[PDB]
Amino acid sequence: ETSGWEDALKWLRENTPEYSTATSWWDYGYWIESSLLGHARDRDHILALFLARDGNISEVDFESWELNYFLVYLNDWAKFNAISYLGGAITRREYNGDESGRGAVTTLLPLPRYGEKYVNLYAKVIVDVSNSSVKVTVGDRECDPLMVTFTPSGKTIKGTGTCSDGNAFPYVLHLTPTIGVLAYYKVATANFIKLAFGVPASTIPGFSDKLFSNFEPVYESGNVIVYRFTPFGIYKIEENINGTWKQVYNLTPGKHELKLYISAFGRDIENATLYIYAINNEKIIEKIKIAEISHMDYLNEYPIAVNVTLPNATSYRFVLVQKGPIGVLLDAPKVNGEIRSPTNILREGESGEIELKVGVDKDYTADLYLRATFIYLVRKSGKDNEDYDAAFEPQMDVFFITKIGENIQLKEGENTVKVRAELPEGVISSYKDELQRKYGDKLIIRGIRVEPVFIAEKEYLMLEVSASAPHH
Ligand SMILES: [Ca+2]
Ligand SMILES: [Cl-]
Numbered sequence: 001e002t003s004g005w006e007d008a009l010k011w012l013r014e015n016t017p018e019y020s021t022a023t024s025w026w027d028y029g030y031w032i033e034s035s036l037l038g039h040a041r042d043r044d045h046i047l048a049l050f051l052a053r054d055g056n057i058s059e060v061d062f063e064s065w066e067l068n069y070f071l072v073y074l075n076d077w078a079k080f081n082a083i084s085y086l087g088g089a090i091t092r093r094e095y096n097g098d099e100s101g102r103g104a105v106t107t108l109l110p111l112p113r114y115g116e117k118y119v120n121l122y123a124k125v126i127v128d129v130s131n132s133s134v135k136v137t138v139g140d141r142e143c144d145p146l147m148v149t150f151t152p153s154g155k156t157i158k159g160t161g162t163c164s165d166g167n168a169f170p171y172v173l174h175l176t177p178t179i180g181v182l183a184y185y186k187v188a189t190a191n192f193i194k195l196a197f198g199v200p201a202s203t204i205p206g207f208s209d210k211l212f213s214n215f216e217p218v219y220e221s222g223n224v225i226v227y228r229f230t231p232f233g234i235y236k237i238e239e240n241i242n243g244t245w246k247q248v249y250n251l252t253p254g255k256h257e258l259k260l261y262i263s264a265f266g267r268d269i270e271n272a273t274l275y276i277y278a279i280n281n282e283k284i285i286e287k288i289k290i291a292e293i294s295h296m297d298y299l300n301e302y303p304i305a306v307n308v309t310l311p312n313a314t315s316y317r318f319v320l321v322q323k324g325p326i327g328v329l330l331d332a333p334k335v336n337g338e339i340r341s342p343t344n345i346l347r348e349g350e351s352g353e354i355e356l357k358v359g360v361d362k363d364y365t366a367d368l369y370l371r372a373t374f375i376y377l378v379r380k381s382g383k384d385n386e387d388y389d390a391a392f393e394p395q396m397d398v399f400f401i402t403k404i405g406e407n408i409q410l411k412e413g414e415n416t417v418k419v420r421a422e423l424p425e426g427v428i429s430s431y432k433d434e435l436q437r438k439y440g441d442k443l444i445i446r447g448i449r450v451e452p453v454f455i456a457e458k459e460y461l462m463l464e465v466s467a468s469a470p471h472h
Helices: 005-015 025-036 042-052 074-086 092-096 191-197 207-214 427-442
Strands: 022-024 069-073 108-114 117-120 125-128 135-138 141-144 147-150 156-158 171-175 179-184 215-220 224-229 232-240 245-248 254-264 269-279 284-296 304-310 315-326 351-360 364-379 392-410 413-422 443-466
Touching (some): 005 215, 005 224, 025 042, 025 069, 025 074, 042 074, 069 074, 074 092, 074 108, 108 125, 191 207, 191 224, 207 232, 207 254, 269 304, 351 392, 351 443, 392 413, 392 427
Parallel strands (some): 022 069, 147 171
Antiparallel strands (some): 069 224, 108 117, 108 179, 125 135, 135 141, 171 179, 215 224, 232 245, 232 254, 269 315, 315 443
């Protein structure tokens, strides 16, 4: 009955921090554990933006949510038209047809291997490759994909993107040793495909290499894969070997002339410090400060040259440190004694004493702000929101309003924090006007949150490499 979910959730319980936060599309994790074994709606839009898109626009600030693990569920391909629609990748027409039931499209279709062919019986789709040029049958029709691609073989073949019926066949076929996937052009390089079916396809060079430094697969079950997430990662390490830069995968002790290629996902690096932690047996034996980055654009990274001397150890951890959000509320916060929603802790122009129970996996000294999060849609096509040509681009804008907590000392475990706070008169309605002004009738606000966020210097694991020997 389970598709690997119970095994995956089990793994999380046993191999991750107590206050570590996991996520999944449509929140299956919570549902499986709560309802079956004893997000919200605004975030669904942002999760879809990520999963259904590719390139710059798919780079979502998951860090604001303090996300640690992401669980993709292969079976979600079945709900991809919805995800695509919610993520702004397709129009209402392509999502489920128009007034006369026409236009719907099948965004994703998995084609498991059938001895030399790829077939999806339910869909009456057959992919005959052995004939060398690739043959695709869909129903009675014979169709030629816009492009077919193979991995690892990285080969690729252009195609007419049409069917024997002559009609348009705007689909891309990605083939892999164990499975194939047919994908509508608007989502042919969607991140979900990369994460779930292992097709590194992206129309932006380097994006895929970077994405995987940000989402590391730490565990896999049936049709479930859990990814460790880090807004900051290293996707490539070059070492100077004869004036020539070369890509390495491990490091030996000693001096090194290195080039680090960092991937920043969703947010900028701001006043950060890079380090190399010498590890001997899941035990840190030395923390080597190696750099300082005052600023790196999350959409325009640049490599960083680095000269380091490393001890022996068994592994090395590249860690980055900068102000980020921390803490997990352990109960509903209270304002003046009364229980209030943690997502809307204070109304505009309201004040009161706030009490919060916060949990952390280590000791932290942090600031406490009230932060606003606006998740909203902007119609990118069509005459009005009811037009079937409409597609809606989800957007997330977050900003801190005011600091209500100074130099708070949080200790590993539960912590109680009472503090007086005031939400300035006009802040929320002001910004809502700023939006209405920029997008007019195209605007559709889906969520406004006012939350108590604890900010502090936190460590981000970018990459861990094993120590190797120069000769073997
Ligand atoms: Ca990036
Ligand atoms: Cl944040």
